[model samples]
Target: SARRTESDIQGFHATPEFGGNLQKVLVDLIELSLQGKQAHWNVVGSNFRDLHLQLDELVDFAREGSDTIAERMRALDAVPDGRSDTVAATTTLPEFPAFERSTADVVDLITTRINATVDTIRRVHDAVDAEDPSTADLLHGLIDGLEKQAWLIRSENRKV
Candidate 1:
């Protein structure tokens, strides 16, 4: 086996050498979801209403993607860890801006974070592809959603 297929993935992490790359994917995706949530609750300004609702949509996308990854990990028999401390400690994405940040500011910050996250996903996809094609496929799906959200956010940010 190239690595551990779904059939053999279940108990892989028990070996103490498990999920080198996919684990990173799962952790960061969950962290990204929380980042979206942070933006949702903190943004304010003239664009508040639309951007507020739209942030919910982005959060949903990240939530869905993170769940998809964690499920895959569990199906392979590996444990899924999305604890606050774990994500807080492990996430490398930039810290979200505090409250009072304007709509443009929040949008810009979210766009930056999304760009970095999707870039990370693409890199992780390559790593997972060789070991777990199914997992890589799932990552591609996540990237698609994140890109779409990023596009909409950027478009709104561009408006005067």
Candidate 2:
């Protein structure tokens, strides 16, 4: 692997390995925002108002998180691919329900999606940390915010 003395590609600072992992996180985050919004627009029944507002917050966090990582990838000279085809083909999230659903169902579905993103980010944390601590720090922030969102949403259906 060291046949080359050093990286000849200008502006390519971060390791491709890191970018590869980070790219997965980016796709997952983007998918989360879409899933959250889908649930947001269709959720009805009791606690509709509260669930609606919370979904807005979740969507916003996911959107912003996606941007943060994409830009960081750019800084690393990694061309972040967020196209619809890319996200659709690569996202690890499950398909959300199409028909209208109750607030309770929406909460569970969206929470699972949120946790999916967090899981992906956590999976890449160590590799990013090894290759680029700054990016790892960025991932940590996303993980914290995303996990918090999932916990809050899941609490809505808690019993006993």
lDDT minimum window of 10 residues, candidate 1? 9-18
Q: What is the lDDT of residue 101 in candidate 2?
A: 97
Which residue pairs does candidate 2 place in steric collision?
none
lDDT of 1 by residue, 1-160 (tens): 5774566433433222235466677677777788788888888887798888988998888888878877777777677788989888887688876666788888889999888888878876766776667677788888888999899998886757
**Compared to the true structure, candidate 1 yields what TM-score?**
0.84
Local distance difference test, candidate 2: 0.90
The digit string of per-residue lDDT tens for model 2 on 21-74 reads 989999999999988998889999999999999999999999999999999998
Which RMSD does model 1 reach against the true structure?
Answer: 5.3
- Which residue segments of model 2 deviate by more than 4 Å? 1-12
- Deviation in Å, model 1, residue 18 alpha carbon: 6.5
**Which ranges in model 1 have alpha carbons more than 4 Å from their true place?**
1-18
Candidate 1 lDDT for residue 95: 81
C-alpha displacement of 60 in model 1, angstroms? Answer: 0.8
